[PDB]
Amino acid sequence: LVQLKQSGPSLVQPSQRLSITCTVSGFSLISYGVHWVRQSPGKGLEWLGVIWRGGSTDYNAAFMSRLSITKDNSKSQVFFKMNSLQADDTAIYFCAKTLITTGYAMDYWGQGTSVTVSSAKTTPPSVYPLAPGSASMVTLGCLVKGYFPEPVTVTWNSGSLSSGVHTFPAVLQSDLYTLSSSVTVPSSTWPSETVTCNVAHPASSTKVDKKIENR
Amino acid sequence: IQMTQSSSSFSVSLGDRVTITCKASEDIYNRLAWYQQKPGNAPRLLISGATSLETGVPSRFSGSGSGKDYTLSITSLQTEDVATYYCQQYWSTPTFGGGTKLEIKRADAAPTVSIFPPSSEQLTSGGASVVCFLNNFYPKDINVKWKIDGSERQNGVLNSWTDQDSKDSTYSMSSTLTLTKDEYERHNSYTCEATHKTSTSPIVKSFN
Amino acid sequence: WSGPGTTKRFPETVLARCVKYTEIHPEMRHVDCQSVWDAFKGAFISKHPCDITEEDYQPLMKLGTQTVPCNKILLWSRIKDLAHQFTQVQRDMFTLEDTLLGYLADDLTWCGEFDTSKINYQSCPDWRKDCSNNPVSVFWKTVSRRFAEAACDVVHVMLDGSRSKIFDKDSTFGSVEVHNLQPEKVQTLEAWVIHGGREDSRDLCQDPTIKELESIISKRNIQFSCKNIY
Predict the structure, then answer these.
(1) Are residues B94 and A126, on separate chains, in Cβ contact within 8 Å?
(2) Are the beta carbons of A49 and A67 closer than 8 angstroms?
(3) After which residues is the backbone of chain B broken at C–N > 2.5 Å?
(4) Cα of A135 vs its chain's centroid, Å
(5) What span, in angstroms and rounded, lies between the C-alpha atoms of C93 and C96?
(6) Which of B86, B122, B165 is closest, CB to CB, to A128?
(7) CA angle, B138 as apex, B134 and B140 as ends, to 5°?
(8) What ranges do the domains of chain A cover?
């Protein structure tokens, strides 16, 4: 069962080295080739380069300057490395199994790694509760404000409800993200019940819970 | 050599028979692949060399096209077949297509409009944000309007939408007015109002 | 001559073959079994069996002209006996010897002389040992050069995973067919390396001959899928 599992940075300072590490399972690098594509919201999808089964490499006209794909067959992993980064080098970077020995259609893709290129220390979010004004159903939500960088994981009741609960896209004002989570129920099941809010900021190695009270 | 998918968004109802286009600067002699990306996940190989399918991929899917103009097609569209649809050429150095997003045609819906006040623990620190959700609706196109004691504010408000839910096949959104506490409590009633097309009248929620 | 001579009742069998091939394959029928035989025969009687050219078969090509499932093709590697052996091959693909001409000359050896003008049933040139341009060697280069120019999509090939040189660059396949695959037409060469025995585990997709083919094919703009089997 083919898997291509990356890992590395995610947050990287302008004009540094980006260095991702694709690591493959249920196949071998002497048999198939490995492509790298990145996706930025602005440019859509772009082909960066390729490290063949052979070992040879072909690079995109543009990045052949700062690019360096390379692999370690014994441990089945491929090494992306890009130099003098920048603002727009922000994107998700994927790997992919060449379908057949040597071809371009790629069957099994990597999870991708969201990379953000910025100077801007890591900010824990501040998590504010959200309850209807003291003075038919009932809907709630959390407010995760001011953190760096992406991403953040919000859960409810340590990990309970999920129906019609729809957590929102983060937004960026002056290098701090902000977002909110929603959640709906019947007038009945609150406030009698518990409605804890569970937020994790993996980058600042922090997690936090915040239950919604009343007014 | 450049890939231009034309149509960028589409909506057609379930069981409907959908079709997409790709065209290249020059003849790519069938060096072409379709990929199906469901957001929040890595893209999927569907079709290679213009028409050759792939395991797992349902028999519903059609690979066609020739010369410069290629084509994806589903027979009787299903549910979990919603995503942006990308096209790759590999006759020279690989290039892809803009993208072509798919949206169901759901039964029309009106929003579920909220409007929470600031959290004590937030103000005690300095600021006071004012949240106004709108989970679950359709069509996507909406409008939200803010008011303070009657006068209008379109500065400092930050919205955020979601993608069409892979369940209730409806959208969602948030407006968020961010003030200092001072600048905050120099005002009493805070109105936010969603101007949709379900009722010709703009639904409101407001407090103090 | 060091090779075996023309197979007995040769002209008699080359006709009966053409007869049968035109019953079975009715969308032929229009063919003049004699004029075909006459064209074949004229390519190499009177000619010295080390001096035959692809032109001499021009006569008979014209009459052999055919149409093929270009996307279901399996190219000529010397080894037609090893391969006809997988129900996957015979069934799902188009050997050069399901074509007409291929059909006629499969398993036959033939040559004439020139100081007369009569077939030689005693001995014939051995491509390796004697001259390399015997009628048979050249017949096959001729008809397969066509086969290769006709292939589209995925084109296959089968190699001996026993031969010392799995992919031989001078083989009819290496030297004729490979350079006549058009990339504007063919997406991929899928090669099947055939292990000479179970027991012989061993990814032959590794062997350098194979790799020289990976490499060559790619300078042509065609993609390469390699595979092992038994």
Answers:
(1) no
(2) yes
(3) none
(4) 41
(5) 10
(6) B122
(7) 85
(8) 1-119, 120-214
Check if the beta carbon of residue B130 is closer than 8 Å to that of residue B179.
Answer: yes
CA B34 to CA C120: how far, in whole Å? Answer: 59
| C-beta separation of A154 from A142 below 8 A | yes
Tell me where in chain B the CATH 2.60.40.10 domain(s) lie: 1-106, 107-208
The separation between CA A89 and the C-alpha centre of its own chain, rounded to angstroms, equals 15
Instruction: Tell whether domain B107-208 is in CATH 2.60.200.40.
Output: no
Residue C216: enclosing H or E segment and its boundaries? helix C208-218
Cα separation, B5 vs B86, in Å, equals 8
CATH of domain A120-214: 2.60.40.10
Q: Hey, which residues 153-212 in chain C have their CB within 8 Å of chain A? A: 188, 190, 203, 205-206, 211
**Residues of C annotated as catalytic (active site), given as ranges:** 70, 152
Name the residue of chain A whose CA is nearest to C228's CA. A31
Nearest chain B residue to C183, by CA: B29
B1-106, what's its fold? Immunoglobulin-like (2.60.40)
Does A1-119 match A120-214 in CATH topology?
yes
The structure tokens listed for B149 are 């004691």
Q: What single letter denotes the amino acid at residue B119?
A: S
B63 touches B19 (CB < 8 A): no
* SS3 of C72-133: CEECCCCCHHHHCCCHHHHHHCEECCCCHHHHHHCCCCCCCCCCCCCCCCCEECCCCCCCCC
Instruction: Return the closest-CA partner of residue B144 out of B112, B108, B174.
Output: B174
Tokens of C40: 């074949």
Q: How many residues does chain A have?
A: 215
Alpha-carbon gap, residue B174 to B144, rounded angstroms: 9
Q: How many CA atoms lie within 13 A of A165 on its CB side?
A: 18
The amino acid at residue B192 is: C
Name the fold adopted by A1-119: Immunoglobulin-like (2.60.40)
Range A99-126 burial, b when 16+ CB lie within 10 A, else e:
bbbbbbbbbbbbbbbebbbeeeeebbbb
Torsion angles phi and psi, residue A150, rounded to 5: -65, 150
Contact in structure between A152 and A177 (CB atoms under 8 Å)? yes
Are the CB atoms for C161 and C79 separated by under 8 Å? Answer: no
Residue from A33, A34, A6 nearest A20 by CA: A6
Resolution rounded to one decimal, in angstroms: 3.0
Q: Do B162 and A184 touch (CB under 8 A)?
A: no
Which residues on chain B are in Cβ contact (under 8 Å) with C187? Answer: 30-31, 49
Q: Is A120 left (phi over 0), alpha (psi -120 to 50) or beta?
A: left
- Give the tokens for residue C85: 């052996």
Going along chain C from its start, the domains and CATH numbers come out as: 1-67+95-150 (1.20.82.10), 68-94+151-230 (3.40.50.720)
CA distance B102 to chain C (A): 30
Chain centre to alpha carbon of residue C56: 17
CB A133 within 8 A of CB A143: no
Q: Which residues in C121-157 are b (16+ Cβ under 10 Å) and which e?
A: eebbbbbeebeebbbbbbbbbbbbbbbbebbbbbbbb
